[PDB]
Amino acid sequence: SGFRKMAFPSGKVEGCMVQVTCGTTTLNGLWLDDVVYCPRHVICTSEDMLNPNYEDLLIRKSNHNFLVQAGNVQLRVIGHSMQNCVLKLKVDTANPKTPKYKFVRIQPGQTFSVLACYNGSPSGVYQCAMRPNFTIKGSFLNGSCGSVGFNIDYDCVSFCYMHHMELPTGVHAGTDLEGNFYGPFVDRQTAQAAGTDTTITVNVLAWLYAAVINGDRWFLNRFTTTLNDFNLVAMKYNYEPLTQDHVDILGPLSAQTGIAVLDMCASLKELLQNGMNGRTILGSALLEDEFTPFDVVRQCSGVT
Amino acid sequence: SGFRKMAFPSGKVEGCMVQVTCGTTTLNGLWLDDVVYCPRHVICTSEDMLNPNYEDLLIRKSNHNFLVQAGNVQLRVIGHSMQNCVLKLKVDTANPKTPKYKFVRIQPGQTFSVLACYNGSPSGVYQCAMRPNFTIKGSFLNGSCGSVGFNIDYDCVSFCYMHHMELPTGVHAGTDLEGNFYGPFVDRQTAQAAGTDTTITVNVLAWLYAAVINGDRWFLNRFTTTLNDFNLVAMKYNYEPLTQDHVDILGPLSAQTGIAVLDMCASLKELLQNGMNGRTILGSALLEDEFTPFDVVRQCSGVT
């Protein structure tokens, strides 16, 4: 028993982290096979950032201008290309530590582990969620660009996020491993604000099931509700509308605990309307929305 | 900017995790050099657990009775010994992935990363704190015994915790890597309750500095206090008494933000007496005590 914001073990991702320098800019790169992936803003200067013409900037760059270093050894760049907002640096050596991997585009509400890196070296790992407004609430400083978000299915690492920028609101924006930004964000130092951030209802319900599984049952009540009634309350509190698809994913958790999904919804309804009254759930004084139903099943069953 | 409960990258520890079987019991082991460390309760049966005579039980065991497996390959046990509550299984092969390591006994209030494991395989990594009552609030299931807690200083892994048991209160108890339990706990399935759990005051103050560094400044006030006045309030709310040693460790955070330690104490005093009033600090509705002043400096400066 016990419930933690658990990240995936980061070893398979540490062996992929390299340092990429271009001009006076140094960020992180992802070395998979004979290719190094990194943010394309590596080719910019602090003046270029206001409105960079990445096509024109890349044209003034050669393979020898991109300095790639894995650990303390230099990699030989034999090709460079821009794919959306990432550069793909073809190196002459395949990464001997390349794991089984996939490049996947996650959905808002889905969670992932971030391996924060500086100068190609790992500093820490934390569990994150793609916000419904496509931002991430991470922990990143100057030099962290190139840090990746990932998930692990037994031996396969599914890369989903590459960190690119911090918005003036302190929140983080990035791309998938094909260089497409999540959300409306552009890699330009301009006025950018994310949409309204809603709470991932299905994740909060999944964490309510994790609480019951661990003994924290105080919030359970004698009531039920309907999807429509619950959703009227969810909208009032800027929660994601709950669908039958969400109910179905909560099926295993409902089966394990014997508490019907709509019954759990009624508990959530009362928690939203009445608050926690000074109590805590799983050591938290607010409703946690960064554990998907898959994360709860995984953590409560010990999937390695 | 941004602040997360960040764990150390776990790669150096994944390469040490093995599976140790003895009789019908399977738990995790730590392979460092030619030695495998694991909980000594691996030699017990479900009947022996009520009051095991570990000396007598170990005597009925030979080197060939301990099945050690790293990945999918078998290790040859050439020696076995009991050191306090751990078994040290000498194997004929040194771990080719052994990092630079130390065995350290941490203090209550200090934090560490846990790599939770099942059948010698890693499932996840989270950041933990040694509670003042010497328990840990982790996430462990049957098969997780042998999972280690650690800290990383550049290339050196300092092992501090080995997971042994869950108390009937759902909290976790374990030893250092010399087999000495933290706290009064014994590796016996008997009535065991931990002392009163107090809040690590210096860590809460360190996290208040992390909040100010990230823009969450609402809780800052026009007041100050003294160590004695603050401590009268800390005792009333079961907080650890703040000493001059704690003030000194908060020196770098005080210097960075320009907010005197006693000034921050006065904010904490008002937060304890008046509550959060429905607001949040670093996305939390309660006072976080699982980040030491070292963790805050490390995360806010990007130490790899």
Ligand SMILES: Cc1ccncc1NC(=O)Cc1cccc(C(F)(F)F)c1
């Ligand atoms: C300083 C920091 C902190 C956290 N995460 C990331 C960062 N770094 C940045 O944002 C770097 C940056 C600066 C201006 C413009 C861009 C660009 F995407 F090209 F538009 C990127």
Ligand SMILES: Cc1ccncc1NC(=O)Cc1cccc(C(F)(F)F)c1
């Ligand atoms: C089931 C579980 C969950 C979380 N963490 C740990 C566990 N497992 C245990 O506690 C195993 C255990 C059982 C009874 C007695 C002991 C002993 F330490 F020898 F005394 C240990």
